[model samples]
Target: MGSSHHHHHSSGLVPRGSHMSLDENEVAANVETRPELITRTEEIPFEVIKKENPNLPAGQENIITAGVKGERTHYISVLTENGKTTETVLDSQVTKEVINQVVEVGAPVTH
Candidate 1:
């Protein structure tokens, strides 16, 4: 029920491919000093892991309890030009959490 994030940084580097002459350097920072950012919400689930039960035969298994997926939100940086998102940064992530999975390895493969 709560969400907010912010970042502030100072760097001399400018956006790539931008030509500037320091005459006035009045370009909206978004043009050189400012960074474009974008946030997105997506479904990223933590997959369930298979646990081995030593009580049963190695080849047998049981579904003691099913696995549940965990969810979360992803945030990141982006570059925009002419209202188009031309590039996407791999530094990203997204939300909630993952539930624990329980399993049993036993005879008859009672999964």
Candidate 2:
């Protein structure tokens, strides 16, 4: 049996003037620039592609494309393994290298 499955249901309409509020710490953790941070519109599953192309590697070609269409703001924490180091929050529209580095170190997991 498969581990799990997630089903996303959308209303098929974008909300108007939708805004979110974040705390100072949250904002700081997400937007800080000391350690450098990288963000992406949405998480992309590229490990499967890596598995498929173990030798024919094309960096980030297998991952989701950013800034081509509708995208959202995501903040990443640039923290050490102990989670005590200073953090940096990144913007997704900045560049590809920014997001790629985070993905590599973040070690995102999928079930």
The TM-score leader among the candidates is 1
Clashing residue pairs in candidate 1 are 70-97, 71-95, 71-96, 72-94, 72-95, 72-96, 73-94, 73-95, 74-93, 74-94
RMSD of each: 10.2, 17.1
lDDT against the true structure, each candidate: 0.57, 0.43
C-alpha TM-scores of all predictions: 0.43, 0.20
lDDT of 1 by residue, 1-111 (tens): 454445456665767656665545454633655356556656654454566666876767676656667665555556567897665544455355555456665444455
Q: In lDDT terms, which candidate is top?
A: 1
Candidate 2: residue 101 lDDT (0-100)? 18
Give the poorly placed runs of model 1, Cα more than 4 Å off: 1-24, 27-34, 56-66, 107-111
